[PDB]
Each structure stands twice: as C-alpha cells, then as structure tokens.
Design a binder for this molecule. Structure first.
Ligand SMILES: [Zn+2]
Length: 140
C-alpha cells in the first residue's frame, strides 16, 4: 500500500483505489495502474520533474529503503500477478530489486522528489509507475 499527496490530489495504484477514490475521481489509467482522486486537505509531496535514473524506493516487504538504478518510463510486458493478468503496462520503469504485491504504493524518490510508486514485481525486478510526466498534479 501507499499514496502520493500532492496539492489537492491523492495518487494511488488503480488496483488499490477505494470507493472514496472513485467517488472523488480526477483521472485514472488501467494501462499505467494509476488513479488520482481529489482531497479536502493540501498535500506537500513534491513530484520530481526530471529524467533521473537513480533514486531510492521503499520496500514494505523488507521494511527497508533501497537505492536503485531504473529504466526510463516505457511500455513493457508484465507477467501475471495476484492483481493483474499478464499484459502490457505503460509509463513503467524497471529496477533490479525486491517487489511483492503488498509493496505496491511504495515511493521511489530522487534528489528532485517523488518519481513514482511501486506497481510491479517478480523475477528479481521492481517496476514503478512514473508520475513525473503528470505536470497537472502541480496546479489547479
Ligand atoms: Zn530527479
């Protein structure tokens, strides 16, 4: 589990979105595994605006933050998980590291702020759904 709280937005994995998220929907995209809902309170998470390929992510299944290299956001084939069939996922970054389904929502951060959230796992890789292209998270 986990979310990003930026301005009056809440960013979660689409597969973990609640009823309240859907009842306050701003934007969602199944191919990216992202959903954004509106918040009453202002969040303070800074979104990275950059092309960094190094950062640190939180792994809830290890109670640890790990430094990783990661690929630029791409369209990748993802093998079946507990929560999605085998399919293509877009705007996805991969690193070598540990990820189990419960790890989804863990923050990946660089020197510029929040890069994205854990979205995929298995075969010794961790996949992160990028948010750095969502420039509207910063406004309205
Ligand atoms: Zn950065």
């Amino acid at each position: 589990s986990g979310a990003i709280y930026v301005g009056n937005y809440r960013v979660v994995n689409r597969h973990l979105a609640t009823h309240n998220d859907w009842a306050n929907l701003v934007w969602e995209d199944s191919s990216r595994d992202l959903l954004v809902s509106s918040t009453t309170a202002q969040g303070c998470d800074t979104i990275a605006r950059c092309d960094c390929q190094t950062g640190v992510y939180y792994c809830s299944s290890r109670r640890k933050h790990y430094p990783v290299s990661f690929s630029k956001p791409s369209l990748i084939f993802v093998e079946a998980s507990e929560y999605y069939p085998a399919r293509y996922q877009s705007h996805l970054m991969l690193a070598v590291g540990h990820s189990e389904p419960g790890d989804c929502g863990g923050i990946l951060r660089c020197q510029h702020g929040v890069v994205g959230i854990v979205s995929t796992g298995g075969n010794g890789l961790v996949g992160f759904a990028d948010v750095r292209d969502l420039l509207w998270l910063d406004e309205e």
